[PDB]
């Protein structure tokens, strides 16, 4: 009945979901294709005979950037077609780190940006281009896009894990952000595949943690002789958990998140 | 020396092209692939190309309903497609000439109706609240990220050929009423051989590429009276399109041959067709 095509398998999240689909028993398979070209998709697809596909390829010079719009541009709008004209659902794991802190939802505040909303932060190449494929990808009534920041997983191993970058800075800002404890949203995600959800989800736990917070249950949990310095351009601000909340109940706040799925398993 | 690749024999301009290179005894070809990679590689291969075109589409004011079928479909040829076609050029050193539009500004502040002010190519699109406009302008956006590619600002294309449907006079010239409104316009029977030229001159970035200065409907359609239907009547409106002029300082620095629209609309239209 189920059965999972996955791109992205040299990948954080693509990997993780392999692992996830093995304990769940759930059929899956590493898309062998390229993003880049149709032709592959389609095999991939016909071959495979998936029944949800799931995105989780991708995450300046003239190089790079071409690359990434090859990748996260042409390539997932491809599949996202792909996807469409055969009737799957396209798990599309994506940022969101293309809002920051305004005016109407100021530092602080306790009202996040929603799912409808305008991504007001759009300076950088990278922030453009993942608003662009967003705002493009709504079009296509199958996908549904996962709006993923700062991803943390239960390995600190991980130079990707964004506990183990902000425990290595020199000094550190202290801004409270929206983050994804992926040991928990992940099997989140899957089940989302087998409701058929579609439309834009913000795919962070509610609430915000601030790097002097993280960096407090770091010492006490897994270094308690850890130090670090505060000083005396990155997107922050609060995503809107409501949607995904409404969804499902049984998601839980960052910080009694990061405390069960992180701290306590990696205790010392 | 030379040998053009051009996509879109479908549609307006692609098929004045082919004409064109016939005229000029410039090889061409029409390419056969879909914009998936493999059949435009297999293309470049086959035609071995100097230069190449993307028509693809779409020649003016397009033009149906905007429903998601309709939108996907926009998306996967001139989003997609064109940013694929882009990437292959690329890699392969090949300058591509992308016919576009500048039905992407409007008329503001900064740019008022009347105001002789013009959008520039450094511009940034201003006018994007419909998905066509939003969507064109994403893709111009991106392929100033393709130092090889060459995006031309088409408005209202307008031919010698007042019998074809996507012409802009025949448009006005078949309406009840009309809105006039100054505009910056292309006549493509003086500007397409001068997109040959850029190609040969390997021209890239953006270019505003309509004929300098404005004309309104009524301007217009007075010169449809004059030189073909004196019997001609229109009546106006005393009561959401794209309404702008476009700088044109660029283009004509590069091609001081370039007429204006009343005269190139004289010149290039009217006067051949009394
Ligand atoms: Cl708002
Ligand atoms: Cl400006
Ligand atoms: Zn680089
Ligand atoms: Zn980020
Ligand atoms: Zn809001
Ligand atoms: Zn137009
Ligand atoms: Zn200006
Ligand atoms: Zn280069």
Redesign the interface.
């Known amino acids: 009945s189920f059965n999972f095509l996955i791109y992205g398998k040299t990948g954080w999240i693509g990997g993780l979901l392999g692992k996830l689909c093995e304990a769940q028993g759930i059929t899956y398979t590493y898309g062998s294709g390229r993003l ?4 592959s998709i389609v095999a991939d697809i016909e071959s495979v005979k998936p029944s949800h596909v799931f995105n989780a390829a991708g995450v300046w010079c ?1 190089s790079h ?2 690359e990434t ?2 990748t996260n ?2 390539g997932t ?2 599949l996202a ?1 792909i996807c ?1 004209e055969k009737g799957l659902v396209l798990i599309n794991y994506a940022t969101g780190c293309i809002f920051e802190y305004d005016s109407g939802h100021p530092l602080g505040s306790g009202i996040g940006f929603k799912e409808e909303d305008t991504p007001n932060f759009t300076g950088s ?1 990278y922030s ?2 993942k608003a ?1 494929v967003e ?2 990808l709504k ?3 199958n996908v549904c896009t996962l709006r993923v920041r700062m991803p943390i997983s239960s390995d600190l191993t991980n130079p990707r894990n964004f506990i183990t970058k902000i425990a290595r800075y020199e000094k550190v800002v202290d801004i409270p952000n929206s983050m994804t404890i992926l040991d928990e949203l992940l099997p989140i995600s899957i089940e989302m595949a087998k409701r058929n959800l579609t439309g834009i989800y913000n795919f962070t736990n509610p609430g915000v943690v601030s790097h002097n917070e993280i960096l407090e249950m770091y010492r006490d949990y897994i270094d308690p002789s850890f130090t670090w310095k505060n000083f005396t351009p990155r997107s922050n601000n609060e995503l809107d958990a409501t949607k995904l909340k409404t969804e499902f109940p049984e998601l839980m706040s960052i910080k009694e998140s990061l405390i069960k799925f992180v701290f306590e398993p990696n205790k010392k």
């Open positions: 880049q070209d149709r032709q003239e950037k071409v719009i090859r541009v042409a709008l491809t077609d469409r190449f453009k281009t662009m705002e493009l079009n296509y009534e």
